[PDB]
């Protein structure tokens, strides 16, 4: 933020909340809902080694 | 007189602790250290109902009060001004938080006080008064309602709204305060403009009056009519009740008579009062030397005290229920219980002002045809 | 691994204990034993262990077998959830009926059936009123959905849930039978308020604020909308009555559930430790804890074959309340939840000793332990000493499941953050403060010019065309359409008033911004908004109220349009109070909050906004002539009232030949002329004709009742005087107050006004209502008239005329004056005290102690038997009611005050002696003896006969009334002497008093 530099980040966060960033659709929500019900890839090689 | 932003971002108000004529006291915290305090918010505009001369004079009065309390700060038994904030409409005065209320509720709940705490409060008040007089500063506003109590029975003077500096050689001719606490000199200033003025004597009279009202339980001078009360005060014929002070020492009564003197010159000062034997105490000393007459006198006094202690113990009377049938007021426990029960039954008609007072509850007068003669 | 073995063992235990009677198809477990029923609360509570073990399985599965196990457990959970939801949805008609008015007959059944989902009992054979079960059901439904598990399928069920939300939203002012299905303390069930139901309801309403039921793949209309005023009202109610469960029970152990793992709704944790210490020190036993004092359930007395307890519970239900280990197994979870471990070990060790081992060697929780029928006398002398034996039903699935969940939590397989995804554990975190934003608008150009003259820059109603401002009643009419379905006969949310908490936040309706003014600037409802002082006062209290809680995100926003009525008499300047208030919320400090002003353009970028989706498209002629020709507002009101009462309730007067002028139209037009003159001489008169009602009167009444207080409407005497001991609906309240006020019309308005005055007064200063147990509006009114007559030295009619002409600020000031309490002096004060019967704080306790050592206290024939002391306790209300009734037989206030003084002097004098009188005491005789002694002493002194006067109907000298109580000549000495003489008169020739 460093003082007066705090405006453009506010504008970017507001645009991100709006839903579109230069023609790209975006979604925002809590991490717990997103991680739930999603495929997670497994790294099980360390257990064998 | 800094900006209100500092007060807004430094102190956060809390629930109300009390109310006044135009100001309310609220609790506040200091964010850096989390220390509790009490803040007095004064509305100089008076809710917008004040003509601007009134606002200006209130602002001048509060500025005089802050700059006169600035010098006095330092005494352990005085209120400490921690921070000041000024706006166009409000003054924020931050003092120490005490804990409980002032003397009125304590005296109402306990009816009357004993000599043990009386000695301490009188000593502290005399020390504060002597310190104030040494600084050439007067108060003219000792009332029991301006003395706060702590959890360890600590008293500090507050409400200096009438305090002002006294240039030496000057004689003030202003009249203020409750009429019951008005010294004869102030009232003489009222009737006659030729009187030179008054001084610290009004302070001694106020100390005597508060001592009287804490000891007896009722003010020495009080009546339903202001004019007759003023004539009562001018006469200076305070009397001692018969079945009320038969269990008090002679030294305290002598001190009572010494505090209240009509003549301003004969009134005792703080230094003279502090030297009375009532406050006498000893810690340790080994330079007691005298003649053999002194040894005989001391041994005779010891023997006399040892003999008298048993006889004083024997002078107690039983319950005497038959005497209760005749007269219950004679016995001290019966009197104290009747008084306390009467106070708790009728405890919410004692407030500020001359209209209602503690003396209105007691009726020691023999209600009869003698009530026809009241005044001229 | 060890974890696999432990979890397999726990699954085996759960399967052998609970899942063996899951009862598929319907999916509802039987309510234990051979009862063949299904209680909602037990069914809801029996699934927490399964849910927790399933969540434990899900995170560590990583294998087909454990994945399938978690799938099966989850599908069992959803099957039971849907089965229970079917019971609710099958009975929409009762919900619709209950949505309007409150009664037990249109309430939902509490015990549903097995297969075919039928009813087992009618509406008059069981207690069908339990808000706690429905609230806890919704709370676990919300938690279940937030966990990520689908329960809801169709969108119609969303409408049903929305309707049920309104069904339970009035729990703060609706009495219920209770969790125990036993009504009040004693039997013959009478519906009464309890803290447990509202404590459960608050969390359930909070949980469903925005939680969508369709998961992450929802739509525009998938979220349940709830208000916020009800939550804060419930919080205030629970805070007021937290220490005691209700007005009849000193404590109920069920308060633990509210202040533990389920439905955290509590603030100021000091109260939490206080109630925990109190319940520990009062209800702890040897092998369990009691529900509450003096419950006879499952006792060797009482004839369990019979119900409707006879009023003879003197000692047959004392110190023999059996036990309940459910509250014990609550303690282990409560301790293990936040940060406590040693207490958890202590409680686990204590509970392991009271366990019983059955088949296959598995834990089993007994219901209660009963006192042996023979060892009963010993317990009365040595409580909590005699051993007990198990007795009754003990497949208790509730406590068993709770203990299983607690053990699983303690083992560490599951984290506390998984049971509650909504993070309800941080309710004790303080919130520093909030900043309030206020915008000021001018109605017309003239007002804008006037404000700009004094240096205030405001903007008119125009020029902000994108932004529109409307009152709140249109917003209520808008909200009256949420969740409306025609096929299922659902009428949507009923009409109700709004708090200021709802109007502050901005709104969006069809790509448009709307702002709504607060409801207290409405002059079309009542006339208290015509006074500037009260406008200022309600602004101050409302700003304080918003600054206090503000549990929503974003800064508030308040619109305060300045009206034409806010100008002075000449209409060229605003009033001094309004200008002072404006200068006051300038500089950022007004009332008890920080106020920042500006323009709506800047507040738009930083303010909470709500998107709304459900409004998206899918000879009388001679009298009339006399009225027309005549003048004066007085005769105007008289003739309009006469015409309305006689022939003109809705008949057209035909006064104007072109427009049909109805009596109501003329009456409502007269308000415009009345308001300009500021004449409080007929505005109340016309308001009585139109019968205007003040909003939120029921809220004021329930706030009055929640303070352990009894209300009473009407002048004396009985039987037209009433007693409102329980909350009543708005229509019932209005009918009752109208019946009490009779045809005096203005009495109803005055009662409403004084009730509202008390209503905003007790919240600010709840300290002047001490020394009082019962208030009467009529008695206060007569005292007001008497005081005004004495002040003005006029007749009663002139005093009434002056009182009815006072501005409302004057009534508030005089009410405060007489509430503070601030010959002719002493007698007046004694009369006031007798009128307001301000009995001391510890009066009833002293009366009880004296009654303990005497046969009774006779007062002019009527006697109070000493047998009352053993069937009743000083803490409860009935003794106070009986004592006041006995003391209220005499009508003269001076008599009641002297009676109080004499009985109190009896109380003090009884302590000195140590004896039993064994006789009845006549207080009137003592008073007469004291009076005779006083008269004899005064005659002995030498007083002339004039001052020893006699009252026309007393036999008591007026100088005795004028006499002060204390002193060497006070009435206390005479009363004490008379009481001592009377005691000696009935004493065996020996006093033997020592102290």
């Amino acid at each position: 933020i460093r003082g007066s530099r705090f405006n453009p980040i506010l504008d970017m966060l507001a645009a991100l909340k709006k839903g579109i960033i230069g023609g790209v659709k975006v979604h925002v929500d809590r991490l717990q809902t997103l991680i739930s019900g999603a495929v997670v890839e497994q790294l099980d090689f360390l257990r064998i080694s | 007189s800094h900006s209100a932003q500092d007060f807004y971002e430094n102190y956060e108000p809390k629930e109300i602790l009390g109310r006044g004529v135009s100001s309310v006291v609220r609790r506040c915290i200091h964010k850096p250290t989390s220390q509790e305090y009490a803040v007095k918010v004064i509305d100089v505009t008076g809710g917008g109902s004040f003509s601007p001369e009134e606002v200006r004079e209130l602002r001048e009065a509060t500025l005089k009060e802050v700059d006169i309390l600035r010098k006095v700060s330092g005494h352990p038994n005085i209120i400490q001004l921690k921070d000041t904030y000024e706006t166009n409409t409000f003054f924020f005065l931050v003092f120490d938080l005490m804990k409980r209320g002032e003397l009125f509720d304590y005296l109402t709940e306990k009816v009357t006080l004993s000599e043990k705490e009386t000695r301490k409060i009188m000593r502290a008040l005399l020390e504060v008064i002597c310190t104030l007089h040494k600084l050439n500063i007067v108060h003219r506003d000792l009332k029991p309602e301006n003395i706060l109590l702590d959890d360890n029975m600590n008293i500090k003077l507050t409400d200096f709204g009438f305090s002002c500096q006294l240039e030496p050689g000057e004689r003030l001719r202003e009249v203020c305060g409750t009429p019951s606490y008005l010294a004869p000199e102030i009232i003489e200033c009222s009737m006659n403009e030729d009187h030179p003025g008054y001084g610290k004597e009004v302070d001694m009279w106020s100390t005597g009056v508060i001592m009287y009202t804490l000891l007896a339980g009722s003010p020495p001078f009080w009546h339903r009519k202001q004019m007759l009360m003023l004539r009562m005060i001018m006469s200076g014929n305070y009397q001692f009740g018969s079945p009320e002070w038969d269990d008090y020492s002679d030294t305290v009564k002598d001190l009572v008579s010494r505090f209240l003197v009509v003549q301003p010159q004969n009134r005792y000062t703080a230094e003279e009062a502090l030297a009375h034997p009532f406050f006498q105490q000893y810690l340790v000393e080994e330079v007691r030397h005298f003649s053999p007459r002194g040894k005989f006198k001391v041994i005779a006094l010891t023997v006399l005290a040892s003999v008298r202690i048993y006889y004083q113990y024997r002078r107690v009377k039983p319950v005497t229920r038959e005497i209760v049938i005749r007269d219950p007021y004679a016995l001290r426990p019966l009197r104290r219980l009747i008084d306390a029960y009467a106070f708790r039954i009728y405890g919410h008609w004692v407030k500020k002002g001359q209209q209602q007072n503690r003396a209105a509850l007691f009726e020691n007068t023999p209600k009869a045809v003698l009530l026809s003669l009241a005044e001229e | 691994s060890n974890s696999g073995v432990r979890l397999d063992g726990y699954a085996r235990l759960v399967q052998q204990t609970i899942l063996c009677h899951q009862n598929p198809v319907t999916g509802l477990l039987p309510a234990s034993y051979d009862q063949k029923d299904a209680w909602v609360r037990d069914n809801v509570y029996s699934i927490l262990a399964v849910w927790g073990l399933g969540l434990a399985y899900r995170k560590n599965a990583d294998r087909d077998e454990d994945k399938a196990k978690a799938y099966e457990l989850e599908q069992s959970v959803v099957k039971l959830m849907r089965g229970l939801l079917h019971c609710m949805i099958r009975q929409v008609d009762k919900v619709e009926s209950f949505k309007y008015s409150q009664s037990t007959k249109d309430s939902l059944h509490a015990k549903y059936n097995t297969k075919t989902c039928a009813t087992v009992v009618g509406d008059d054979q069981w207690g069908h009123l339990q808000l706690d079960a429905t609230s806890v059901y919704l709370l676990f439904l919300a938690q279940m959905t937030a966990s990520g598990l689908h329960i809801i399928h169709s969108l119609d069920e969303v409408n049903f849930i929305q309707n049920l939300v309104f069904y339970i939203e009035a729990a703060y002012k609706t009495a219920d039978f209770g969790i125990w299905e036993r009504g009040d303390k004693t039997n013959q069930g009478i519906s009464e308020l309890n803290a447990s139901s509202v404590g459960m309801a608050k969390a359930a309403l909070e949980a469903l604020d925005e939680l969508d039921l369709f998961g992450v793949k929802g739509g525009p209309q998938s979220v349940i909308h709830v208000l916020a005023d009800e939550v804060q009202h419930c919080q205030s109610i629970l805070n007021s009555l937290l220490p005691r469960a209700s007005t009849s029970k000193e404590v109920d152990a069920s308060l633990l559930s509210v202040v533990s793992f389920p439905a955290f709704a509590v603030e100021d944790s000091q109260l939490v430790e206080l109630t925990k210490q109190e319940i520990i020190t009062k209800l702890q036993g040897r092998y369990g804890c009691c529900r509450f004092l003096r419950d006879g359930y499952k006792t060797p007395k009482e004839d369990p074959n019979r119900l409707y307890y006879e009023p003879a519970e003197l000692k047959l239900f004392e110190n023999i309340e059996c036990e309940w280990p459910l509250f014990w197994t609550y303690f282990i979870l409560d301790g293990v939840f936040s940060g406590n471990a040693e207490q958890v070990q202590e409680y686990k060790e204590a509970l392991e000793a009271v366990l019983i081992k059955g088949k296959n060697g598995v834990p089993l929780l007994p219901e209660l332990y009963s006192v042996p029928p023979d060892r009963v006398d010993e317990e009365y002398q040595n409580p909590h000493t005699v051993d007990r034996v198990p007795m009754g039903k003990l497949p208790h699935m509730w406590g068993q499941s709770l203990y299983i969940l607690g053990s699983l939590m303690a083992e560490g397989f599951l984290a506390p953050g998984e049971i509650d995804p909504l993070n309800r554990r941080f309710s004790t975190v303080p919130k520093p403060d909030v900043v309030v934003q206020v915008s000021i608008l001018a109605e017309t150009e003239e007002i804008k010019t006037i404000l700009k003259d004094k240096g205030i820059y405001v903007e008119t109603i125009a020029e902000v065309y994108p932004i529109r401002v409307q009152p709140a009643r249109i917003l209520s009419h808008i909200y009256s359409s949420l969740g409306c379905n025609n096929r299922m006969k659902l009428s949507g949310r009923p009409y109700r008033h709004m708090g200021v908490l709802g109007t502050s936040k901005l709104y969006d309706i069809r790509k448009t911004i709307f702002t709504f003014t607060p409801q207290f600037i409405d002059q079309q409802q009542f006339y208290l908004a015509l006074d500037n002082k009260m406008i200022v006062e309600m602004l101050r209290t409302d700003l304080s109220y918003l600054c206090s809680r503000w549990r929503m995100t974003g800064q508030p926003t308040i619109t305060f349009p300045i009206s034409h009525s806010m100008l002075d008499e000449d209409g060229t300047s605003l009033n001094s109070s309004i200008l002072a208030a404006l200068r006051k919320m300038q500089d950022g400090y007004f009332g008890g909050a920080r106020v920042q002003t500006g323009k709506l353009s800047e507040f738009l970028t930083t303010s909470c906004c709500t998107h709304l989706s459900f409004m998206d498209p899918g000879d009388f002629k001679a009298l009339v002539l006399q009225l027309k020709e005549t003048s004066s507002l007085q005769e105007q009101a008289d003739i309009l009232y006469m015409l309305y009462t006689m022939k003109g309730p809705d008949w057209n007067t035909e006064l104007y030949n072109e427009r049909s002028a109805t009596v109501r139209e003329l009456l409502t037009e007269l308000y415009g002329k009345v308001g300009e003159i500021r004449h409080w001489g007929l505005i109340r008169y016309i308001s009585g004709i139109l019968r205007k009602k003040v909003e939120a009167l029921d809220e004021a009444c329930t706030d009055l009742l929640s303070h352990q207080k009894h209300l009473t409407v009407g002048l004396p005497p009985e039987p037209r005087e009433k007693t409102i001991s329980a909350p009543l609906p708005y229509e019932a309240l209005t009918q009752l107050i109208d019946e009490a006020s009779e045809g005096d019309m203005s009495i109803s308005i005055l009662t409403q006004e004084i009730m509202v005055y008390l209503a905003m007064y007790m919240r600010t200063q709840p300290g002047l209502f001490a020394e009082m147990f019962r208030l009467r509006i009529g008695l206060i009114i007569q005292v007001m008239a008497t005081e005004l007559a004495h002040s003005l030295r006029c007749s009663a009619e002139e005093a009434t005329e002056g009182l009815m002409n006072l501005s409302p600020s004057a009534m508030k000031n005089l009410l405060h004056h007489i509430l503070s309490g601030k010959q002719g002096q002493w007698q007046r004060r004694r009369r006031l005290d007798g009128a307001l019967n301000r009995v001391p704080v510890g009066f009833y306790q002293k009366v009880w102690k004296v009654l303990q050592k005497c046969h009774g206290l006779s007062v002019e024939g009527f006697v109070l038997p000493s047998s009352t002391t053993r069937e009743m306790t000083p803490g409860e209300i009935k003794f106070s009611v009986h004592v006041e009734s006995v003391l209220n037989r005499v009508p003269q206030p001076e008599y009641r005050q002297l009676l109080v003084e004499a009985i109190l002097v009896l109380t003090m004098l009884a302590d000195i002696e140590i004896h039993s009188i064994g006789s009845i005491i006549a207080v009137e005789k003592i008073v007469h003896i004291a009076n005779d002694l006083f008269l004899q002493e005064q005659k002995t002194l030498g007083a002339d006969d004039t001052m020893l006067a006699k009252d026309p109907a007393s036999g008591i000298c007026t100088l005795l009334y004028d006499s002060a109580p204390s002193g060497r000549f006070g009435t206390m000495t005479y009363l004490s002497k008379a009481a001592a003489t009377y005691v000696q008169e009935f004493l065996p020739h020996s006093i033997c008093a020592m102290q």
Side-chain angles (χ1 to χ4, degrees), chain B residues 8 12 19 26 43 47-48 88-90 224 243 319 324-326 328-329 337-339 341-342 345-346 348-349 360-369, chain C residues 580 583-584 587-589 594 765 771 821 826 829-830 833 838 897 901 904 908 938 941 943-944 947 959 963-970 972 977 980 993 995:
Chain B
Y8 294 154
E12 190 276 331
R19 322 185 185 277
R26 318 189 56 138
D43 191 355
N88 295 337
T89 57
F90 294 110
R224 93 174 63 219
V319 72
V324 178
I325 299 292
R326 270 87 70 188
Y329 188 79
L337 64 88
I338 288 189
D339 291 352
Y341 293 142
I345 297 169
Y346 298 87
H348 67 270
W349 292 271
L361 202 173
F362 263 120
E363 55 174 3
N364 278 295
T365 182
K367 184 179 287 293
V369 289
Chain C
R583 175 62 181 221
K584 215 168 272 184
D587 290 330
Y589 194 89
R594 202 165 284 99
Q765 310 191 34
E771 193 177 1
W826 276 97
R829 210 156 62 245
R830 305 295 66 61
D833 292 333
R838 290 180 177 176
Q897 193 156 354
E901 296 288 328
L904 191 61
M908 60 203 87
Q938 287 290 348
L941 200 153
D944 67 78
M947 71 185 328
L959 271 288
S963 296
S966 175
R968 90 197 301 283
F969 264 81
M972 210 84 88
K977 285 194 240 171
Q995 72 272 17

Side-chain angles (χ1 to χ4, degrees), chain C residues 337-373:
Chain C
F337 206 52
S338 57
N340 201 349
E342 293 83 3
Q343 189 189 257
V344 173
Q345 176 65 21
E346 190 272 332
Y347 273 125
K348 184 261 291 180
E349 289 215 280
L351 193 77
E352 282 291 1
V354 305
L355 212 69
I356 190 66
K357 292 159 191 171
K359 62 173 43 173
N360 318 114
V362 287
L364 274 162
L365 198 77
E367 172 163 46
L368 59 92
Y369 291 85
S370 196
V371 187

Side-chain angles (χ1 to χ4, degrees), chain C residues 864-950 952-975:
Chain C
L864 192 63
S866 55
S867 179
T868 301
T869 194
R870 64 151 60 260
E871 59 95 21
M872 162 85 188
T873 188
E876 286 169 352
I877 301 287
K878 294 290 296 314
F879 182 76
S880 175
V881 166
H882 294 88
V883 161
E884 299 280 17
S885 176
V886 163
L887 278 159
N888 262 321
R889 310 304 292 195
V890 67
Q892 293 82 17
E894 297 175 355
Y895 292 172
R896 83 182 72 245
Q897 193 156 354
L898 59 84
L899 289 172
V900 161
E901 296 288 328
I903 62 171
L904 191 61
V905 75
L906 288 169
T907 63
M908 60 203 87
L909 284 182
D911 288 332
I912 300 286
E913 59 178 357
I914 305 94
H915 291 286
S916 163
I917 308 308
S919 298
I920 194 161
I921 317 294
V923 177
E924 283 288 316
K925 172 52 163 284
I926 302 164
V927 173
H928 308 330
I929 288 281
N931 188 359
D932 291 331
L933 289 191
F934 157 81
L935 292 173
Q936 276 293 288
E937 177 156 292
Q938 287 290 348
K939 280 278 189 73
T940 297
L941 200 153
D944 67 78
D945 307 330
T946 71
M947 71 185 328
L948 303 94
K950 195 65 59 162
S954 85
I956 291 168
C957 197
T958 62
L959 271 288
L960 190 146
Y961 298 123
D962 205 358
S963 296
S966 175
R968 90 197 301 283
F969 264 81
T971 66
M972 210 84 88
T973 61
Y974 302 132
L975 290 165

Side-chain angles (χ1 to χ4, degrees), chain A residues 2-45:
Chain A
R2 198 47 48 206
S4 70
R5 156 191 181 83
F6 181 74
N7 292 318
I9 57 184
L10 291 164
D11 291 331
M12 183 278 288
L13 293 193
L16 173 56
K17 173 56 188 305
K18 285 315 313 174
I20 185 166
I21 297 298
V24 177
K25 283 182 230 163
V26 67
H27 212 177
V28 298
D29 196 359
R30 77 179 71 246
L31 183 63
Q32 180 47 87
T33 56
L34 273 296
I35 193 66
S36 66
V39 186
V40 59
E41 303 144 341
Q42 179 51 258
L43 283 77
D44 52 315
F45 63 90

Side-chain angles (χ1 to χ4, degrees), chain C residues 41 52 239 301 319 402 435 487 504 545 584 757 936 948-949:
Chain C
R41 190 175 44 257
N239 276 344
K301 312 200 207 278
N319 308 67
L402 266 289
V435 188
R487 190 176 298 110
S504 298
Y545 214 80
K584 215 168 272 184
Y757 294 145
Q936 276 293 288
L948 303 94

Side-chain angles (χ1 to χ4, degrees), chain C residues 501-533:
Chain C
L501 184 58
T503 66
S504 298
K505 176 173 56 60
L506 291 165
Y507 292 115
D508 188 326
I509 298 85
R510 192 184 188 297
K511 330 297 199 273
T512 308
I513 310 302
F514 286 93
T515 318
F516 298 102
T517 55
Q519 72 275 16
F520 55 78
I521 314 169
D522 194 1
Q523 91 284 17
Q524 274 289 83
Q525 270 288 346
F526 63 91
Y527 50 77
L528 293 197
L530 190 62
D531 199 323
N532 294 318
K533 304 312 161 263

Side-chain angles (χ1 to χ4, degrees), chain C residues 93-165:
Chain C
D93 56 353
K94 299 290 285 294
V95 172
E96 178 79 354
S97 297
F98 199 95
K99 255 161 82 186
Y100 305 129
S101 71
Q102 323 286 310
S103 67
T104 301
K105 307 302 307 202
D106 59 353
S107 53
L108 279 298
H109 288 206
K111 43 193 288 183
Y112 289 109
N113 202 345
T114 49
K115 281 76 175 176
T116 66
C117 199
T119 64
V120 286
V121 291
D123 292 331
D124 56 83
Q125 290 83 16
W126 202 264
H128 296 319
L129 183 63
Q130 290 176 53
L131 277 296
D132 197 298
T134 303
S135 177
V136 76
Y137 175 35
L138 286 175
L139 182 74
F140 292 103
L141 166 60
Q143 297 299 110
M144 202 46 88
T145 294
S147 64
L149 314 171
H150 301 285
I151 301 299
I152 211 71
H153 292 347
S154 66
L155 61 89
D156 288 14
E157 295 149 19
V158 179
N159 295 350
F160 186 62
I161 292 282
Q162 191 77 65
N163 271 257
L164 196 147
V165 161

